[PDB]
Amino acid sequence: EDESEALRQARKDAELTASADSVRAYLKQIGKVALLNAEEEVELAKRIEAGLYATQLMT
Amino acid sequence: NSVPGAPNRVSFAKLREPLEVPGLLDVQTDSFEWLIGSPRWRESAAERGDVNPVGGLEEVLYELSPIEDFSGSMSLSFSDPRFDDVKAPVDECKDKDMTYAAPLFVTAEFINNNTGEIKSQTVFMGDFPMMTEKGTFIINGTERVVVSQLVRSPGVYFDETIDKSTDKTLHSVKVIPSRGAWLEFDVDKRDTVGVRIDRKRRQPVTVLLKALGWTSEQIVERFGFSEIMRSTLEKDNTVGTDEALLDIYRKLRPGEPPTKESAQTLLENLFFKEKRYDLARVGRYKVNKKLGLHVGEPITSSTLTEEDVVATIEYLVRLHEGQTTMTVPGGVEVPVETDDIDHFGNRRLRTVGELIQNQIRVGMSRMERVVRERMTTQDVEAITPQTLINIRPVVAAIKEFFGTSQLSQFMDQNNPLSGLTHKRRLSALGPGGLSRERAGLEVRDVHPSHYGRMCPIETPEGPNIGLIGSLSVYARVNPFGFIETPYRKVVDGVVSDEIVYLTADEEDRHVVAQANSPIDADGRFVEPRVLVRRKAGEVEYVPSSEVDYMDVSPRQMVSVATAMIPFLEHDDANRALMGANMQRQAVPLVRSEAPLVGTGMELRAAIDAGDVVVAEESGVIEEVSADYITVMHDNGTRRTYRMRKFARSNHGTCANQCPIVDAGDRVEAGQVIADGPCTDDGEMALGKNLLVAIMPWEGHNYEDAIILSNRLVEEDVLTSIHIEEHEIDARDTKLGAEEITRDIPNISDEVLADLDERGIVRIGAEVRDGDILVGKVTPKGETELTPEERLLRAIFGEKAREVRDTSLKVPHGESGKVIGIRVFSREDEDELPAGVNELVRVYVAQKRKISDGDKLAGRHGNKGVIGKILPVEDMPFLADGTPVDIILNTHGVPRRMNIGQILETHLGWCAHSGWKVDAAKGVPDWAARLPDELLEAQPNAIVSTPVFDGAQEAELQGLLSCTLPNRDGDVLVDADGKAMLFDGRSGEPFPYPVTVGYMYIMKLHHLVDDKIHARSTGPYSMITQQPLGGKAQFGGQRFGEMECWAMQAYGAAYTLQELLTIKSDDTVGRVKVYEAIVKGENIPEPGIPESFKVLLKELQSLCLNVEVLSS
Amino acid sequence: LYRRVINRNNRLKRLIDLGAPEIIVNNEKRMLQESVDALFDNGRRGRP
């Protein structure tokens, strides 16, 4: 079913495929990062604000 | 007969035909009627499948609707496809180059399931091209004809194969549905099976049946007798429905991790969903017949079902066991056998309806995509069907289909027969078909099912041999796409008049009889053994009581182009093939005399070709003129047929129409009123009746050459009016405007005499190669004015002449008088293309006489060019003194096996001189079966001969015996056909008699005037400096590598280098050679070809360091 | 084909100079490789 080595390495092997079509390979790779919500967006925006502030301070 | 104006054509036919030939255009008209859904077709299906009367457009609209959004609370549907009157009648759309078309209207229902509101908007679908009465479309003025296509009908196809290793038999299947993914079930080299899904070579049936919600108990219950599938299920090695689903996901959608539900829905969306796998309505019924699934149920759910898959498994596995009959649980029993792919029960025919349906389906798919995109981006209740609809893709798709598609081609019309045969022709190349390179040897062969459906003789001799053919004369297209032919059914040796129609597959389960059988009028064949066609196409003897079908008539297996060949049965198949093909390319002469010896098919072929005026309604003729005929019908009103005079055909021939009625005659509905280009008294006439001697004369008729007398040239017996058109357009340009004016720079006056001040040639003025036609002057802009030009103008006072005279001139090698000028312009408020503002087209015609090199041929396969036209003195003449017109060689007819035309020659002489059979002491033995009214024939009497039931040898010999003379007492020909004839060169009589008689010859459209070409220094191509090729361009013959082989073998090196470098390529070499030969100087040393430098640069651009080293 | 090569090369230059995550840079380099592939021999690898 899903556990007991039937589906985990199944997913790993299915993902680890040749993907001859270039668009297919790109869509396979893009299916790796989870989507984001508003709180994550504002938190990452705060992190980027801190990063650019630190870059300005370095300058 | 049965034609009101039919000339009296006596016939040698023995038996009668129970039915007349159907309207040979019925495969184009009826299909378009189905497409539109006209009331004629509406009532046609009322007794031929009224279970679901629906048109092609109605079917597509119903399939498309309803279309909704992701939420399902808002949707749109289509209904009521209503047409409209055509914008303009045919001739004007042929004049100003507009498509013969009418607006299309449909009703759109907007539904909003959230609250519910109705919006019935009558949207303008577009401009749908229509089909004319002749079955030809008009696109941009041109007349185009679409042809039906032969493809493999979607369904199930089992087949057998030998491994050639241990001689084990293997059985494979290919369920090939349109717009879907293939499944290939077979028995592998080893014992197990192969279940290839969409080209993936793994996973025997174990995972598939398991993936259908089953488990091992079901597959072991269904299959306990099939040890092959028992071994396979034992070799499952997988337990678990989800395990099988993920294993399928491996080899159906790799690259994405599988989940519990993804594979289960993926299988349904791949096979059992009618959006990604929909075998057409033909495919579902083909599967049902092949498997006996449903035998009395309406057609619905075009998508493939699971019981279909299980029945396919059972059928295949039982076939591997060698079983004969399979009975599916829940269905009738079906015999188990391999399916042939060329049998006409598996090859359908996509007529015009199906092709236009497919293009409309693509257009509606784009429509559904765009409307699905748009229905969500706009807020509810602010959206209307008009803004949901953007009709652009539909008209784009129809324009894509009608133009720049190889299945809807330019009409081949240089005589009525070519037009008739271009339609009702079956092709096999194109979208969904097989290319000639893709075509094997098996497909080109004649299948036993071709009989009565597709003619086995009519097919082009070129590379396309066998790929494209012509429809039979009695053939019918079922409302289902399969082809079908009529046949009378005999019961217990009693022949019935009831005509029933059978397809290719329905013929196997019956036994059809011979066409010309010894019928006694009581239905009983006098001998028990009769030639019959068995199930597998085998011919054999069989007693009479068990046969159940017979051919409706002879010439049922043959088309309309081959049914016009007299004495067909006496000719080899190859020569009959070529004769049928040359019948298509005869030219329309200026008189078109009817043939003496022919077949009854000529009248019907001429009548229904559509180019002869036929009185639709009976009545007296009010008045007759060359331009028009006014006919007064019985019910007061009148009708004026406007005759078409001197119209250029698509191949530049003549299409005059001469009325053949008087000012006070009565004409019945259906009678021929006026004759077309190649018709006499409403019957086909593609040639002339010429007296023939078959002796080989002094080598001028050597190797198929033909010699003619000057009488044909002087009496205009073989001369054709040929018309060409020359378009030329003045268009806007950054330099300004190009003017159609007489202000033509640096021209004389003797060549300006025949132009009007408007700037074009006077109507009725003679031109020739090089003469100016239209004076169009373009602003030259600027260039390097040579100093020598300045000294030139300083010597004479010539103006700069600031404009370039790129006027239109008659191209090389033609002449003749001008027929008409048509001019269009923007200030004439015309629909000119955006960019051009004048467009003038001039028609020039010349009465092309017959000369050396013109190809003349009979309709029996004999061909040849005119070796010479020698004067009337030097012609062998009979004792009466009439010179022979055409002499052909005798060394071709016995070797090439076309003796039929010798019989035609003798029958023609009998028909010309007239005959009478002495019925004093009873009728002679040979004339006992000869019909009455054929024992007497006046001079120049026309006869007829059906192709397979015609005049026999004994009857023709008896006719030759009594051949009463015309004016003097002189039986020129003896009983054996030969006749004495006097030499016109030396004067003494020839030692031995030779055969003479009247033969029907035709001039082919391969005249030498359009076939002679030569050039000294013309233009050259861009990339490589080689001269171009063709007749439109100045050309230049291709000196290929095969001729390079010959020149190298000769040992001639200087000639080869000359032909390569300076004569073709070396630019400086070309100009230097021309200067040297003009200057009378020695031709210089050839240089280096430019194409080699082009190759060197090209190879360098491919990252290949190529340098040529001096040392 | 030359226009495709030029476009891909210029976009890769922009990506490198601007500074982008390595996935987009790898995708652009793959597109450049496939574009040169199409230029030298169309249809040899993959659909033409």
Q: Do C31 and A29 touch (CB under 8 A)?
A: no
Nearest C-alpha of chain C: how many angstroms from A1? Answer: 34
- C-alpha dihedral over B544, B546, B548, B553, to 10 degrees? -20
Q: Is A44 on the interface with C (CB under 8 A)?
A: no
Q: HSE on the CB side for B97, CA within 13 Å?
A: 12
Q: Which residues contact B184 (CB under 8 A, 6 or more apart)?
A: B172, B173, B174, B194, B195, B196
Q: CB of B422 within 8 A of CB of B559?
A: no
Q: Do C27 and A21 touch (CB under 8 A)?
A: no
Spell out where chain A is interrupted, by the residue before each break (C to N > 2.5 A). none
Tell me how far apart the alpha carbons of residues B131 and B25 are, in angstroms, rounded to a whole number.
Answer: 12
Tokens (6 digits) for B866: 């005119």
What residue type is B923 in one-letter code?
Answer: V
Q: Which residues contact B330 (CB under 8 A, 6 or more apart)?
A: B307
**Residue B355 vs residues B360, B405, B493: alpha-carbon distances, Å:** 9, 11, 44
Identify all chain A residues contacting B242, using CB atoms and an 8 Å cutoff.
1-2, 6
Q: Which of B878, B859, B893 is nearest to B978 (CA)?
A: B878
**Cβ neighbourhood burial of A51 (10 Å; 0-12, 13-18, 19+):** exposed
Q: Which of B652, B689, B657 is nearest to B1007 (CA)?
A: B652
3-state secondary structure of B62: helix
Q: CB of B631 within 8 A of CB of B649?
A: no
Tell me how far apart the alpha carbons of residues B1098 and C14 are, in angstroms, rounded to a whole number.
Answer: 31
* Strand ranges, E, within B715-828: 720-733, 736-737, 739-740, 766-768, 772-774, 776-779, 803-804, 808-809, 815-825
Angle among Cα B54, B55, B57 to the nearest 5 degrees reads: 125
DSSP state for residue B822 in the 8-state scheme? E
Widest pairwise Cα distance in chain B: 110
Tell me how far apart the alpha carbons of residues B519 and B527 are, in angstroms, rounded to a whole number.
Answer: 10
Pick the residue of C8, C24, C27 with the most A CBs within 10 A to test the interface with A by mutation: C27
Q: Which of B725, B496, B689 is nearest to B594 (CA)?
A: B689
Instruction: Give, for B844, the enclosing helix (H) or strand (E).
Output: strand B836-848
Nearest C-alpha of chain A: how many angstroms from C36? Answer: 15
Q: Which of B202, B214, B219, B246 is nearest to B313 (CA)?
A: B219
Q: Do C46 and A21 touch (CB under 8 A)?
A: yes
Q: Do C34 and A21 touch (CB under 8 A)?
A: no
DSSP state for residue B369 in the 8-state scheme? H
Q: Which of B218, B348, B330, B212 is nearest to B271 (CA)?
A: B212
Resolution in A: 3.5
DSSP state for residue B549 in the 8-state scheme? B
Tell me how far apart the alpha carbons of residues B594 and B690 are, in angstroms, rounded to a whole number.
Answer: 12
Q: Which of B71, B69, B102 is nearest to B84 (CA)?
A: B102
Q: Which residues contact B1079 (CB under 8 A, 6 or more apart)?
A: none
Pick the residue of B237, B247, B256 with the most A CBs within 10 A to test the interface with A by mutation: B256
3-state secondary structure of B285: helix
Q: CB of B156 within 8 A of CB of B185?
A: no
DSSP state for residue B672 in the 8-state scheme? B
Q: Residue B94 CA to chain centroid, in angstroms? A: 21
Q: CB of B492 within 8 A of CB of B382?
A: no
Nearest C-alpha of chain B: how many angstroms from A35? Answer: 17
Angle among Cα B585, B591, B594 to the nearest 5 degrees reads: 75
Q: Do C23 and A29 touch (CB under 8 A)?
A: yes
Instruction: Give, for A42, the enclosing helix (H) or strand (E).
Output: helix A38-58
Identify all chain A residues contacting B255, using CB atoms and an 8 Å cutoff.
14-15, 17, 19, 24-25, 28
**Residue B768 vs residues B729, B820, B844, B845, B1017: alpha-carbon distances, Å:** 21, 16, 10, 11, 21
Q: Do A20 and C31 touch (CB under 8 A)?
A: no
Tell me how far apart the alpha carbons of residues B225 and B204 are, in angstroms, rounded to a whole number.
Answer: 18
Q: Residue B783 CA to chain centroid, in angstroms? A: 51
3-state secondary structure of B325: strand
Residue with tokens 């019309």: B413
CB atoms < 10 A from the CB of B420, how many? 28
Q: CB of B77 within 8 A of CB of B120?
A: no
Q: CB of B662 within 8 A of CB of B969?
A: no
Nearest C-alpha of chain A: how many angstroms from C18? Answer: 15
Q: Which residues contact B976 (CB under 8 A, 6 or more apart)?
A: B960
Q: Between A20, A26, A29, which is nearest C46 by CB?
A: A20
| CA nearest to C29 within chain A | A22
Tell me how far apart the alpha carbons of residues B194 and A14 are, in angstroms, rounded to a whole number.
Answer: 22
Q: CB of C16 within 8 A of CB of C25?
A: yes
Q: Which of B863, B858, B900, B904 is nearest to B583 (CA)?
A: B858
ω into residue B66 within 30 of 0, thus cis?
yes
DSSP state for residue B828 in the 8-state scheme? G
Tokens (6 digits) for B1092: 């080699």
Gap between the terminal Cα atoms of chain C: 12
CB pairs under 8 A between A and C: 9
Which contacts of B576-579 are long-range, i.e. CB under 8 A and separated by 24 or more positions?
B576/B457, B576/B860, B576/B861, B577/B457, B577/B458, B577/B459, B577/B461, B577/B861, B578/B461, B578/B861, B578/B863, B579/B857, B579/B858, B579/B859, B579/B860, B579/B861, B579/B862
| DSSP β-ladder status, B469-470 and B494-503 | unpaired
Q: CB of B1027 within 8 A of CB of B1036?
A: yes
Tell me how far apart the alpha carbons of residues B86 and B696 are, in angstroms, rounded to a whole number.
Answer: 60
Residue with tokens 């791949």: B270
Q: Do C46 and A29 touch (CB under 8 A)?
A: no
Q: Residue B709 CA to chain centroid, in angstroms? A: 36
The residues with which B174 forms a beta bridge, in sequence order, are B184
- Write down the experimental method used for this entry: cryo-EM
Identify all chain B residues contacting A28, using CB atoms and an 8 Å cutoff.
255-256
Angle among Cα B558, B559, B565 to the nearest 5 degrees reads: 80
Q: Do A1 and B260 touch (CB under 8 A)?
A: yes
| CA nearest to B245 within chain A | A1
Q: CB of B519 within 8 A of CB of B507?
A: no
Q: Do A14 and B242 touch (CB under 8 A)?
A: no
Tell me how far apart the alpha carbons of residues B152 and B207 are, in angstroms, rounded to a whole number.
Answer: 30
Identify all chain B residues contacting A9, using CB atoms and an 8 Å cutoff.
none
Q: Residue B632 CA to chain centroid, in angstroms? A: 39
Tokens (6 digits) for B2: 């049965």
Nearest C-alpha of chain A: how many angstroms from B259? Answer: 8
Residue with tokens 């765009």: B370
Tell me how far apart the alpha carbons of residues B711 and B886 are, in angstroms, rounded to a whole number.
Answer: 10
Q: CB of B599 within 8 A of CB of B576?
A: no
Tell me how far apart the alpha carbons of residues C14 and C23 are, in angstroms, rounded to a whole number.
Answer: 15
Q: Residue B524 CA to chain centroid, in angstroms? A: 42
CB pairs under 8 A between A and B: 40
Q: Which of B481, B412, B480, B472 is nearest to B446 (CA)?
A: B472
| CA nearest to A21 within chain B | B255
Tell me how far apart the alpha carbons of residues B8 and B28 are, in angstroms, rounded to a whole number.
Answer: 31
| DSSP β-ladder status, B688-693 and B886-888 | parallel
Residue with tokens 């007299």: B566
Identify all chain C residues contacting A55, using CB atoms and an 8 Å cutoff.
none
Q: Between B240, B243, B255, which is nearest A17 by CB?
A: B255
**Residue B155 vs residues B278, B312, B448: alpha-carbon distances, Å:** 11, 11, 21
Q: Which of B656, B507, B515 is nearest to B592 (CA)?
A: B656
Gap between the terminal Cα atoms of chain A: 57
Tell me how far apart the alpha carbons of residues B615 and B629 are, in angstroms, rounded to a whole number.
Answer: 10
Q: Is A48 on the interface with C (CB under 8 A)?
A: no
Tell me how far apart the alpha carbons of residues B305 and B283 are, in angstroms, rounded to a whole number.
Answer: 12
Tell me how far apart the alpha carbons of residues B861 and B581 are, in angstroms, rounded to a whole number.
Answer: 9
Angle among Cα B133, B138, B142 to the nearest 5 degrees reads: 130
| CA nearest to A30 within chain B | B256
DSSP state for residue B47 in the 8-state scheme? G
What angle in degrees, to the nearest 10, is found between the helix axes of B900-913 and B953-961? 30
Tokens (6 digits) for B904: 């035609």
Angle among Cα B515, B518, B521 to the nearest 5 degrees reads: 100
Tell me how far apart the alpha carbons of residues B694 and B876 are, in angstroms, rounded to a whole number.
Answer: 11
Residue with tokens 């969500």: B376
Q: HSE on the CB side for B42, CA within 13 Å?
A: 5
